[PDB]
């Protein structure tokens, strides 16, 4: 088959900056003057969206800041001025021969200014507790950059190995991320302790932030 390799696999650029993504094909996708390379944009949870076809044609309805160039085995997708809405994974795709093949994709993020997270902590509900399990949830809202550290403490004992976290995709509204961390304990363990704390470390925080509650007092 025709193998497509994109570069880079990942990039982060300041809003408004020029962004170029390249695609190299293992064989030529040229046919009678035309170059059958296509570009797609895929945003979180959505189907890919066609941006460019036949190497350089802008698909109807797509903003003019997207353009394509190249021929033979080498192609370039250009975003003239990166907009917040342009966070996505970008794919090249050859349509010269079956099987029609895609590049591995290039992740594009907008590099905005540093923003500290707003931190919230949630006790387990009484409803859940009767099931025998306690989930303690810590929310880190609207921060940048994506890298953040959450430390769980139960009566000042550092919790390790009993939590999981999840991060949203970049929000085009403000180019920030949010993060959710869940501490899971048995009901019995939860009832044996008083102070539950979520300690957050982040670049936008001059020193770590801690949110806590005392079990029983609500």
């Amino acid at each position: 088959d025709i193998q497509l390799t994109q570069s880079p696999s990942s990039l982060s650029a300041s809003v408004g900056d020029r962004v170029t993504i390249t695609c190299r094909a293992s064989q030529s996708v040229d046919y009678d003057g035309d170059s059958y390379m296509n570009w797609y944009q895929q945003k979180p949870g959505k189907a890919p969206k066609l941006l460019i076809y036949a190497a350089s044609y802008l698909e109807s309805g797509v903003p003019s800041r997207f353009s394509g160039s190249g021929s033979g085995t080498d192609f370039t997708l250009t975003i003239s001025s990166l907009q917040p809405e342009d966070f996505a994974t970008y794919y090249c795709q050859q349509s010269h021969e079956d099987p029609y093949t895609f590049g591995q994709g290039t992740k594009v993020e907008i590099k905005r200014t540093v923003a500290a997270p707003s931190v919230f902590i949630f006790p387990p509900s009484d409803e859940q507790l009767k099931s025998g399990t306690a989930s303690v949830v810590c929310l880190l809202n609207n921060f940048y950059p994506r890298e953040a550290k959450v430390q769980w403490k139960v009566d000042n004992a550092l919790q390790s190995g009993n939590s999981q976290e999840s991060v949203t995709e970049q929000d085009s509204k403000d180019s920030t991320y949010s993060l959710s961390s869940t501490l899971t304990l048995s009901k019995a363990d939860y009832e044996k302790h008083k102070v539950y704390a979520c300690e957050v470390t982040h670049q936008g925080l001059s020193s770590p932030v801690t949110k806590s509650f005392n079990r029983g007092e609500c």
Partner: protein, 222 residues
Amino acid sequence: EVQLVESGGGLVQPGGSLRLSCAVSGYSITSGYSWNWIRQAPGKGLEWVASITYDGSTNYNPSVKGRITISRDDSKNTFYLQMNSLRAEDTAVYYCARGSHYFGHWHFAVWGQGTLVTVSSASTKGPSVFPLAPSSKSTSGGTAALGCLVKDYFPEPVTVSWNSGALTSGVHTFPAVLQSSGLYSLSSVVTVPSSSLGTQTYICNVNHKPSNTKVDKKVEPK
């Protein structure tokens, strides 16, 4: 306008078969140059697997050919994907897509929403929904966060909306995590004015189609 709506997704046992359908509306299926199935394994890239052209000619990706059938039903304005002998490798979101009459044909301008097929031995399990109650009291009377914890379900996906879709601003619905139990857990939060906690009703609407579980959870100050 043209819309492609896929059905048939969900849980399939290894060795089992899948049948997907793509119902086309706002367009005659007979007028498309070609109709296609393209799939995407979780966190991975895209793979074209099959096509049918307007004259009925079929084509398959050799990476799966020999256990795959694309077909159409003109009178229902629908086309189908049949695969059997499913393996774990076949777990993916499957998209239907339309090819073009122009410029080499095999680029795809119109896509379905995609449907997730999960190949697994495990059985379906509906989620428990627990409140993430706000505040106790606000910090400076500014912005409060509340949410829903959607715990212990299988397979993916679940959808969460707030106030039947009338509350979208400030909503974050996080990627599910896979627990060591083999069950998924997900949280959805929303940030709201803390001055509205006494007067505004907040309800998370949770839907887990594989288990036919729908839940509406009112979340309020504890």
